Amino acid sequence: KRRNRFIIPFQGSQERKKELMSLSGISIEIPINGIFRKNSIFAYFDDPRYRRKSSGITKYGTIEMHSIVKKEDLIEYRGVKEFRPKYQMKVDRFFFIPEEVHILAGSSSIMVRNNSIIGVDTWITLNTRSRIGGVVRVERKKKKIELTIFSGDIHFPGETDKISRHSGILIPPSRKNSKDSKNLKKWIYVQRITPTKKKYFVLVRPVVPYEITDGINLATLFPQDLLQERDNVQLRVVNYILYGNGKVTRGISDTSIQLVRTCLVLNWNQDKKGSSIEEARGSFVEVRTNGMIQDFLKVNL
Amino acid sequence: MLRDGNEGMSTIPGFNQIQFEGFWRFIDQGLTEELSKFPKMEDTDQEIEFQLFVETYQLAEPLIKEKDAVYESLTYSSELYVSAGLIWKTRREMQEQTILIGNIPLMNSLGTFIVNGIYRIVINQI
Amino acid sequence: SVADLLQDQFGLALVRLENVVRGTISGAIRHKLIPTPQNLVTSTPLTTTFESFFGLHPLSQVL
Numbered sequence: 013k014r015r016n017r018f019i020i021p022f023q024g025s026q027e028r029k030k031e032l033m034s035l036s037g038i039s040i041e042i043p044i045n046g047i048f049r050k051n052s053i054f055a056y057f058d059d060p061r062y063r064r065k066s067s068g069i070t071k072y073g074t075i076e077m078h079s080i081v082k083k084e085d086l087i088e089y090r091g092v093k094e095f096r097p098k099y100q101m102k103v104d105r106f107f108f109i110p111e112e113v114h115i116l117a118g119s120s121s122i123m124v125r126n127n128s129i130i131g132v133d134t135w136i137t138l139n140t141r142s143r144i145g146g147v148v149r150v151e152r153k154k155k156k157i158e159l160t161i162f163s164g165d166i167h168f169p170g171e172t173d174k175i176s177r178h179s180g181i182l183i184p185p186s187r188k189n190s191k192d193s194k195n196l197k198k199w200i201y202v203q204r205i206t207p208t209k210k211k212y213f214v215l216v217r218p219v220v221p222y223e224i225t226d227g228i229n230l231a232t233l234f235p236q237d238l239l240q241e242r243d244n245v246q247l248r249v250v251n252y253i254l255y256g257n258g259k260v261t262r263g264i265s266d267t268s269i270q271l272v273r274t275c276l277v278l279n280w281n282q283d284k285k286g287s288s289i290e291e292a293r294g295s296f297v298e299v300r301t302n303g304m305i306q307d308f309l310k311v312n313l
Numbered sequence: 314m315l316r317d318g319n320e321g322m323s324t325i326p327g328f329n330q331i332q333f334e335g336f337w338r339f340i341d342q343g344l345t346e347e348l349s350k351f352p353k354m355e356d357t358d359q360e361i362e363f364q365l366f367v368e369t370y371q372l373a374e375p376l377i378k379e380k381d382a383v384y385e386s387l388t389y390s391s392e393l394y395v396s397a398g399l400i401w402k403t404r405r406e407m408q409e410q411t412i413l414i415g416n417i418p419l420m421n422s423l424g425t426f427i428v429n430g431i432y433r434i435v436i437n438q439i
Numbered sequence: 440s441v442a443d444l445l446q447d448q449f450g451l452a453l454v455r456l457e458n459v460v461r462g463t464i465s466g467a468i469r470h471k472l473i474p475t476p477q478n479l480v481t482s483t484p485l486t487t488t489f490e491s492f493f494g495l496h497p498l499s500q501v502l
Contacts, residue, residue, distance in 0.1 A: 016406045041405035045398065051359035052402035087471045280359055291355040291362050291402065335441035343446035351453050356464050363460060363479065393485070399476040412477045414456070415485025417449075418493070425502050428493040432502035435441040 018042040020055075036060055049294040050245040050311045054276035056252070062222050062271035069162075069260040070108035070222070070271065071182060077101070097252035097275070107182045107219040108271070109201050111162035111260070112144055118156050126150035127207055129166065147205065147213070164203070164217035175214060179204035182219050222271060224251055244289045245311060246279045289313070314341070331437065332424035344370060348395065362400035369396035372417070379421055386430030390416040448492045455484035 019037035040055035042048050081100070116122060116137055124136045127149045134142040136159055148161035169176045182201040190196070203215040229248035237243070252275045255261055261269045282289040294311035320326050348367045355362045373392040382389035393416070398409030418426045425432045463479050493499050 016404055043400065043405055043407035045407050045409055047400075047407060048405045049362060049400060049402055052405045054405075085471075288357055289359075290357045291359045293353060293362065293364070293400075332441055335443075336445070339442040339445045343442060343449065347446060347449045347453060350450065352457060354457055354461055354464075356468065358468065360468065361464055363464065388490070390489075397476065399474075399479060401473070408476060410476050412480055413482060414480060415452070415482035416489070417485065418489060423502070426493060428490065433493050433499050434502050435444055436498045436500060437440045438498060 013044045013046070016041055016043065033060060047293075047295045048309070049292060050247075050278045050309065051280055051291060052278060054247070054278050056276065057274040058270050059272055059274055063268050064108075064110070064271070065263055065266075065268045066110045067113045067261055067263045067269075068108045068110040068220075069258070070106050070255055072101070072103050072106040072257040075104070095254060097254075097273075099253045099256040100250065101253065103224055103253070105221060105223045106257070107199060107201070108222055109162060109182070109217050109219045111160060112142070112146070112148075113262070114140055114159040116140065116157050116159065118153070120157070122150065122157065122159075124148055124150065124159065127205075130161070147207070147215070162215070162217050164201075164215035167214045167216065168211075169214065173214075175202050176204070178202045224272065227251065242281070242283065242287075242289075244280045244282060244292065244313065246281060248277045248279065250275050250277055329424050332420065332435065335435075336420050336424075340372075344393075360402050362402060364397055364400060365395060366397045369411075370394070375419065379427060382427045383430050383432075387427075388416070388418060388429055389421070389427035390418045392416055444492075444496075444498065448488060449485075452485045452488040455488060456480065459484055 018040050020040065021035055021037040024035055036058050038055050038057045040048075041053050114136055121138055122136060124130055124134060127147060129147040130142065131145040132142050134148075136142065136148070142161075144161065144163040146161040146163055147166065148159050150157055150159045167173075167175075180201070180203045182199055184199045185197050187196075199219045199221070201215075201217045201219050203217070205213050205215055207213045227249050229246075231246055231248070233247050234243045234245070252273045254269070254271055254273075261271075263269045280289055292311050292313040294309050297308070297310035299306045320330075345367065348365060348370060351365045351367075353362070353364060371394055373394060375389060375391050377385075377387055377389065379389050381387065393414045394411050395414055396409070396411040398407050400407045418428060420426060423432070425434045427433075459481065460479055467474060467479065
């Protein structure tokens with residue numbers, strides 16, 4: 013009861029014995045006395061499908077964005093910057109392109125200048141090395157410095173290129189009378205980087221696709237009562253996105269950044285002028301027989 | 314509960330058993346049968362919940378003394394402590410602690426209550 | 440006798456207490472504070488209820 017959270021591990025089947033993937037236990041918000049309740053923040057599971065430990069910028073495809081959620085006043089909790097699902101959008105697809113970021117000390121030794129093209133294994137500091145090859149740019153912060161370099165092929169338009177107009181945008185693969193373009197089977201992000209006041213470069217970077225499935229809501233997870241009592245608990249499944257459109261994730265050392273996490277929502281449906289349903293009290297009830305036991309949350313109002 | 318049953322059947326009983334037995338019966342059973350009637354009140358937002366565990370109540374030894382209760386015009390009473398937490402449906406938490414509901418006056422050896430430095434007695438009704 | 444009168448007074452005090460906690464829980468959300476359970480219950484109802492009982496009820500008389 014040290015923390016108000018419990019991890020229920022889901023056992024894996026015997027069909028996977030080559031990948032040692034960690035089973036993301038269902039994380040539930042449990043009370044100190046283990047007596048939780050419905051109509052509150054239910055259990056959540058961090059899906060490993062869209063979890064990456066490399067810093068990446070994600071952009072969602074253009075769609076209908078009608079925010080059906082008014083602004084909620086911020087409630088400070090000991091100045092703890094927890095992860096809040098500020099973008100609960102039914103996004104069909106998005107493109108995330110990785111990048112390499114180094115947050116070196118302000119007084120640390122830097123060997124690479126800003127906006128300098130460096131290859132792999134470029135020692136930017138005394139004990140800091142590289143992982144890819146790109147044009148790394150360095151910016152000085154209040155107490156540190158940041159070096160950023162996203163893997164991309166460099167190019168310069170020469171009297172025949174039509175890619176100058178598209179800047180910092182991801183374009184899907186196009187096959188329309190391409191008599192000179194080959195191996196363009198994947199979407200590429202074109203960025204117009206200002207190398208100099210009179211010379212600019214174009215960076216074509218690989219992009220990784222990420223889609224979302226259809227959420228199934230259990231609106232009939234209870235039996236029809238014979239006492240004509242309305243069930244005030246409705247359980248639904250949804251997805252929570254860490255970053256919004258065109259947002260770059262910051263990754264700490266040995267830290268896996270998650271893009272989408274499964275969430276469970278408990279809501280209510282109360283009639284008018286019949287009964288003002290306020291809340292209910294729940295606990296865990298058990299019953300065992302025939303070498304099998306039943307485990308479910310018993311919620312009575 | 315029952316004391317020696319042959320009281321009033323073999324000797325003249327003490328002229329206090331009415332008030333004394335009434336107060337003891339109250340302390341023993343009325344507290345339980347009234348705390349259970351306390352509801353499970355809460356908010357309409359499905360966000361908070363209040364609970365009062367019933368089989369945890371107890372009283373505390375009075376702070377002041379009867380002589381000092383009548384000396385400073387105070388009220389001889391004992392504090393009622395019931396263990397019960399508060400449930401928040403925001404992180405699904407329940408903070409459990411023992412609270413002080415209030416103060417209840419106590420009878421002395423005379424069968425009376427000392428309220429505001431005044432001896433008071435309760436008259437039976439038919 | 441004293442038992443039934445005290446039981447009724449305690450019932451009235453508990454009703455007053457639950458009304459007070461209802462008001463507090465109405466005011467415990469709009470102020471965005473996480474209070475300990477003791478902050479939701481004050482010893483106003485029981486004390487004042489018993490003082491009013493022993494001061495106004497015609498069945499409680501000075502010795």
